[PDB]
Design an enzyme around this catalytic site. Structure first.
Site, short mmCIF file in Angstrom:
data_model
loop_
_atom_site.label_atom_id
_atom_site.label_comp_id
_atom_site.label_asym_id
_atom_site.label_seq_id
_atom_site.Cartn_x
_atom_site.Cartn_y
_atom_site.Cartn_z
N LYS A 15 0.82 -1.20 0.00
CA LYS A 15 0.00 0.00 0.00
C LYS A 15 0.86 1.26 0.00
O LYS A 15 0.58 2.21 -0.74
CB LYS A 15 -0.93 -0.02 1.21
CG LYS A 15 -1.86 -1.22 1.25
CD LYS A 15 -2.89 -1.11 2.36
CE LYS A 15 -3.83 -2.30 2.35
NZ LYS A 15 -4.93 -2.16 3.35
N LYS A 27 -2.80 0.26 9.49
CA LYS A 27 -3.17 -0.66 8.42
C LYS A 27 -1.93 -1.41 7.96
O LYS A 27 -0.90 -0.79 7.68
CB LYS A 27 -3.80 0.10 7.25
CG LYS A 27 -4.92 1.06 7.65
CD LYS A 27 -5.21 2.08 6.56
CE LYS A 27 -5.86 1.44 5.34
NZ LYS A 27 -6.01 2.41 4.22
N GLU A 54 -1.66 6.18 8.54
CA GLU A 54 -2.37 7.04 7.61
C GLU A 54 -3.45 7.80 8.35
O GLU A 54 -4.10 7.25 9.25
CB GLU A 54 -2.98 6.25 6.45
CG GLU A 54 -3.16 7.07 5.19
CD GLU A 54 -3.50 6.23 3.98
OE1 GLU A 54 -4.02 5.10 4.16
OE2 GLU A 54 -3.25 6.69 2.84
N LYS A 55 -3.64 9.06 7.97
CA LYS A 55 -4.66 9.89 8.59
C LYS A 55 -5.98 9.15 8.64
O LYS A 55 -6.25 8.27 7.82
CB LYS A 55 -4.82 11.20 7.82
CG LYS A 55 -6.02 12.03 8.23
CD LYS A 55 -6.03 13.37 7.52
CE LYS A 55 -7.30 14.14 7.82
NZ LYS A 55 -7.53 14.29 9.28
N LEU A 65 -10.06 9.68 8.38
CA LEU A 65 -11.16 10.53 7.95
C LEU A 65 -12.44 10.03 8.61
O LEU A 65 -12.63 8.82 8.78
CB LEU A 65 -11.31 10.50 6.42
CG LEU A 65 -10.20 11.23 5.65
CD1 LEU A 65 -10.14 10.76 4.21
CD2 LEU A 65 -10.42 12.73 5.71
N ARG A 109 -6.74 -6.13 -10.05
CA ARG A 109 -7.46 -7.32 -10.49
C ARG A 109 -8.79 -6.85 -11.07
O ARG A 109 -8.98 -5.65 -11.30
CB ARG A 109 -7.66 -8.30 -9.33
CG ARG A 109 -8.12 -7.64 -8.05
CD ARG A 109 -8.74 -8.65 -7.11
NE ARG A 109 -8.88 -8.11 -5.76
CZ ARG A 109 -9.77 -7.19 -5.40
NH1 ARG A 109 -10.61 -6.67 -6.28
NH2 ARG A 109 -9.80 -6.78 -4.14
N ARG A 138 -25.01 -7.79 -3.09
CA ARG A 138 -24.46 -9.12 -2.85
C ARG A 138 -25.39 -9.94 -1.96
O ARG A 138 -26.10 -9.40 -1.11
CB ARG A 138 -23.09 -9.01 -2.20
CG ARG A 138 -22.12 -8.16 -2.99
CD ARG A 138 -20.81 -7.96 -2.25
NE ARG A 138 -19.89 -7.13 -3.01
CZ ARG A 138 -18.62 -6.95 -2.70
NH1 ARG A 138 -18.07 -7.54 -1.64
NH2 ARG A 138 -17.87 -6.16 -3.46
N1 LIG Z 1 -7.29 6.48 5.41
C1 LIG Z 1 -8.56 6.02 5.62
N2 LIG Z 1 -9.50 6.79 6.20
C2 LIG Z 1 -10.76 6.35 6.41
N3 LIG Z 1 -11.19 5.13 6.03
C3 LIG Z 1 -10.34 4.26 5.42
C4 LIG Z 1 -8.95 4.67 5.19
N4 LIG Z 1 -8.34 3.64 4.60
C5 LIG Z 1 -9.26 2.67 4.46
N5 LIG Z 1 -10.45 3.02 4.96
C6 LIG Z 1 -11.70 2.22 4.96
O1 LIG Z 1 -11.42 0.83 4.74
C7 LIG Z 1 -11.92 0.43 3.46
C8 LIG Z 1 -10.95 -0.55 2.82
O2 LIG Z 1 -9.67 0.06 2.71
P1 LIG Z 1 -8.57 -0.62 1.76
O3 LIG Z 1 -7.26 0.10 1.94
O4 LIG Z 1 -9.15 -0.69 0.37
O5 LIG Z 1 -8.40 -2.04 2.47
P2 LIG Z 1 -8.67 -3.51 1.86
O6 LIG Z 1 -7.35 -3.83 1.21
O7 LIG Z 1 -8.91 -4.34 3.07
O8 LIG Z 1 -9.89 -3.38 0.96
C9 LIG Z 1 -12.09 1.71 2.66
O9 LIG Z 1 -13.11 1.59 1.67
C10 LIG Z 1 -12.48 2.69 3.74
O10 LIG Z 1 -13.89 2.61 4.03
#
Ligand SMILES: Nc1ncnc2c1ncn2[C@@H]1O[C@H](COP(=O)(O)OP(=O)(O)O)[C@@H](O)[C@H]1O
Ligand SMILES: Nc1ncnc2c1ncn2[C@@H]1O[C@H](COP(=O)(O)OP(=O)(O)O)[C@@H](O)[C@H]1O
Ligand SMILES: *C(=O)CCCC[C@@H]1SC[C@@H]2NC(=O)N[C@@H]21
Ligand SMILES: *C(=O)CCCC[C@@H]1SC[C@@H]2NC(=O)N[C@@H]21
Ligand SMILES: [Mg+2]
Ligand SMILES: [Mg+2]
Ligand SMILES: [Zn+2]
Lengths: 77, 57, 449, 449, 77
Positions: D116, D159, D201-202, D204, D292, D338
């Site tokens: 990431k 994360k 990461e910040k 939100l 993908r 789904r």
């Molecule tokens: N920096 C962030 N701030 C707020 N919500 C986040 C952030 N990163 C991820 N999320 C939440 O987690 C979900 C999945 O994040 P993602 O990085 O795509 O993880 P995965 O690989 O598990 O799908 C996002 O759609 C969002 O709702």
């Protein structure tokens, strides 16, 4: 026993007129030839005659309640 | 599962008005008739073709 | 919008109309027969009314019982659909006068266009080309009949102007049996449809069934959607219908569409209807109008993106057309394949119970029907149990999906016309696209020793 | 075109890929587990291979057995799909080198973008905006960690850069448990995904999940299709996904799409992939790339008319993009829902047998799955058993159809998330459209007395 | 009786080399410790050893015929 059913579709009325005695009422038995109810359809207030003489066990409908074809109306035991 | 429903009844409150003189009957066969149709088929029940009264005029 | 309507029909079109109604938020009333108590559309409907016993005449054609239901439930319109009371102009008159709204054309055009010969005459008056023929109902002037037959050119076909369902038509090979053939055709028309009118129309040997869909609100607006082509037929009954039709360049599309729109304006047409045609050597010869919603309506919906039933229900609510002629677009190509309860060869209905059923699904595949497991097909009406589709960006893709979907599909307990559909799909000429109507009839073959 | 390929996956995506293959005339090979012997896509495939026992690691992740199957059957490529070996860059390397073609991106971008933090760094380099955060993997300099936390602003989230499936993420409320939270998050990442990399990461609090689909052939061509929005989530797992997203004016659409296309060109991206984002106050902050074919791919197919899997199989055959950026159009609006084998509330998988099943069908409704009567759901993998859709010309129509289809749908024998789907559909705010990701999480509520 | 099944996927070979005697052949019984076939996968010609001593009733496969996981190979009675 036997159940007599409306042979057509339309509003169900038991008193021939807006303020009238019911053709039949629970208790009093009917005969083969007698009007049991009124099934209005297009303002042509038709009538229903039994086919088996017996007691009026109950009435499965109520005045003003629409009925469909072959809708059970009264069960004669 | 809609495949198995309750078989509900109809609501009596619903009320529609049909004009009085647009539907007639034939006691010979019992089939309700459209007054204008019967009157256009010279007062002849098209179902059982049973003749009926007609006005002299 | 219409506060409530009655689905004066049964089955695939009944269920489809029910979906459209629920979409537009218009409550629904299902008028069923005693045998069709457990139909899908019946069970998914707000209010269900039984109007008669199993037979068609006692129950579904019982115009009095249908109007009874419509009055008791408080509807303010009715949808007949196609079949049963689709084109019964008198049904339209009664529904109009009783106090409700007839979803479709006004009864007047039902009468004008339900008589094939008057329809062709009005078409000639409106500029729509027509097949050579009698140009009038056949009288008893055998001299004039044979003069007209010689003028148009043998062979000829006798068609009852009040006939329907691909029946009551006979081909006359010569004058030897012209009188007897005419008499027996008139007799069959009288027996079935109660109407004796017969007329003479030229016979074509190399036609390509076409029909152009048109929407008109009856207020001076009439638009023409994509084309169609039902070339494949068995006993003049459609099986496969591709929309648009191969080889119909946009020039011909717009040329005939403008004339058909003008015709709808002239007739003041209201509702959804389709001007059938016949095609060869870049020509069109009107042959009928199905003043209703056809059966192969989807194959215009998926290529145009417009839901026809919703357009009808909007017109009936008084709304003019909300779609201009220019804004209508045909994006791609479609194909449809009816499923019927007949024997795959003998073409004998085989009603029964469906033990097992499995929809196709998958991209671009549309499954319209009401059947399901445990659903005992009633041996009492038409033999259709599903209008399956496969939309593709071209004919090859659409056929491919069809093949795949038909592979997936399982319907067990009753024989059905799936084998024939697969075999047609695999046919080389059909995959090329552009066969004459007879194609399937000729493949049938003849006697063998 | 690829003379044959192997469906290195199982289920909805497996069956969908099988349909696409049969469409393009590319023979199919189904690699199944011993428990998935009677899957739909397995039974509808040309050649079926068993590679291992029920568990995922022994059978479907057994890269050696999959390559064995691919070599014995003579394939010249493989489709992994999504899940199982979707993003395993090493699987891509082995498939590339073994002699076959990996349908998707080259392994190099799998490695670059599967981390990431490197993905976000390259995005920053390419002009894609990114969320405030560490800007690098977290070290053991607690002073620097807390300095960065103060700089971006609390609250914060940890994360694992090698994590997946919405797991291995924890929210840190303050420095009090920052060290322990980081340690346990790293431990969970090590235990599950074998990778310890963690980054800051910040956080939100008012996001609206967005993701823009892009197709690039890897030869300097990269196009961007319609948008998406998976706002509704439970435990960060999507349930409902609408495409396009409400309120995304074409200006923002094209603005972000051009940047994402440039990013795909810079990375030299090959195959179909989606740049996730996060939205608020008219801003975008990249958060990941799912290199993908996503799960909610259809909701771009039905509004764009382009079949994504076919585009992938064409790219893998070496064909460049056959669709220009301008010729891509979004015509309407879609919605997806789904179906999963969980308890409607407890969210516990409930595998079992499906006694009775009935597809929706009807106009605009798309049913993707493999389930059917007699199909004993295996208690051994993900809980998804169908990706249902309802395409409409606007959001109201699409929701309406969804409601109707869900009404029609019957799946009996195993509890499922249909009640929740109906309840979400009836939700007022959802029908308005534009809720924050939390919407569903907040509706969940809290304790009651 | 018992059926021994390939635990991996790959080409089935009975003779270890292109021109070689089969490890086993019908008739002659085997023991627990003995190679029964070769399941090539990525040029790494692996080998299969029985687990139940008994007669080789028959061979359900043929050299050159690919086999899958848990594919039955030989039945020992
Ligand atoms: N920096 C962030 N701030 C707020 N919500 C986040 C952030 N990163 C991820 N999320 C939440 O987690 C979900 C999945 O994040 P993602 O990085 O795509 O993880 P995965 O690989 O598990 O799908 C996002 O759609 C969002 O709702
Ligand atoms: N004049 C004609 N020449 C050749 N074939 C015809 C002619 N009229 C009808 N047919 C055939 O019969 C089919 C049905 O004709 P139509 O008039 O629409 O009857 P119906 O009312 O039974 O549908 C046409 O599609 C065509 O194949
Ligand atoms: C016409 O106004 C439609 C309603 C039916 C009216 C008639 S008057 C005789 C019956 N009695 C009654 O209460 N309503 C029926
Ligand atoms: C490599 O060329 C792939 C084919 C496998 C070759 C080997 S040589 C040993 C085995 N005997 C045989 O017939 N083929 C196998
Ligand atoms: Mg016709
Ligand atoms: Mg993600
Ligand atoms: Zn009469």
């Amino acid at each position: 026993g036997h159940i007599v059913r409306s042979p057509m579709v339309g509003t169900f009325y038991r008193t021939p007129s807006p303020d009238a005695k019911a053709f039949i009422e629970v208790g009093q038995k009917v005969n083969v030839g007698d009007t049991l109810c009124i099934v209005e359809a297009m303002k042509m207030m038709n009538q229903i005659e039994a086919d088996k003489s017996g007691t009026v066990k109950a009435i499965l409908v109520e005045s003003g309640q629409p009925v469909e074809f072959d809708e059970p109306l009264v069960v004669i035991e | 599962s809609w495949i198995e429903r309750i078989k509900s009844n109809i609501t009596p409150t619903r009320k529609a008005s049909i004009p009085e003189g647009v539907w007639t009957k034939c006691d010979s066969c019992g089939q309700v008739l459209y007054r204008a149709e019967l009157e256009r088929n010279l007062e002849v029940c098209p179902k059982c073709d049973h003749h009926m009264r007609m006005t002299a005029r | 919008m219409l506060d409530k309507i009655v689905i004066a029909n049964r089955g695939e079109i009944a269920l489809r109309i029910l979906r459209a109604c629920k979409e537009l938020g218009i409550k629904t009333v299902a008028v069923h027969s005693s045998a069709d108590r457990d139909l899908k559309h019946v069970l998914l409907a707000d209010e269900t009314v039984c109007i008669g016993p199993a037979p068609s005449v006692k129950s579904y054609l019982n115009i009095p019982a249908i109007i009874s239901a419509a009055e008791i439930t408080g509807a303010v319109a009715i949808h007949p659909g196609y079949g049963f009371l689709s084109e019964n102009a008198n049904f339209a008159e009664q529904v109009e006068r009783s106090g409700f709204i007839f979803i479709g054309p006004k009864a007047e055009t039902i009468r004008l266009m339900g008589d094939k010969v008057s329809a062709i005459a009005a078409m000639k008056k409106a500029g729509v080309p027509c097949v050579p023929g009698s140009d009038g109902p056949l009288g008893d002037d055998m001299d004039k009949n044979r003069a007209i037959a010689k003028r148009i050119g043998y062979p000829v076909i006798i068609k009852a102007s009040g006939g329907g369902g691909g029946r009551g038509m006979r081909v006359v090979r010569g004058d030897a049996e012209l009188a007897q053939s005419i008499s027996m055709t008139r007799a069959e028309a009288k027996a079935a449809f109660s109407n004796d009118m017969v007329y003479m129309e030229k016979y074509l040997e190399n036609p390509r069934h076409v029909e152009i869909q048109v929407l008109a609100d009856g207020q001076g607006n009439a638009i023409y959607l994509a084309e169609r082509d039902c070339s494949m037929q068995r006993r003049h009954q459609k099986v496969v219908e591709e929309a648009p039709a191969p080889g119909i360049t946009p020039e011909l599309r717009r040329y005939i569409g403008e004339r058909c729109a003008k015709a709808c304006v002239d007739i003041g047409y209201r509702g959804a209807g389709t001007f059938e045609f016949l095609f060869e050597n870049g020509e069109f010869y009107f042959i009928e109008m199905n003043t209703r919603i056809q059966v192969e309506h989807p194959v215009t919906e998926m290529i145009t993106g417009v839901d026809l039933i919703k357009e009808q229900l909007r017109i009936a609510a008084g709304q003019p057309l909300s779609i201009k002629q220019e804004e209508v677009h045909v994006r791609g190509h479609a194909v449809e394949c009816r499923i019927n309860a007949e024997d795959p060869n003998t073409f004998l209905p085989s009603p029964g119970k469906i033990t097992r059923f499995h929809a196709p699904g998958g991209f671009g595949v549309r499954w319209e029907s009401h059947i399901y497991a445990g659903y005992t097909v009633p041996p009492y009406y038409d033999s259709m149990i599903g209008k399956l589709i496969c939309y593709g960006e071209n004919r090859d893709v659409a056929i491919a999906r069809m093949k795949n979907a038909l592979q997936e599909l399982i319907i067990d307990g009753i024989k059905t016309n799936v084998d024939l559909q697969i075999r047609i799909m695999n046919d080389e000429n059909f995959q090329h696209g552009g066969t004459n109507i007879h194609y399937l009839e000729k493949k049938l073959g003849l006697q063998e020793k």
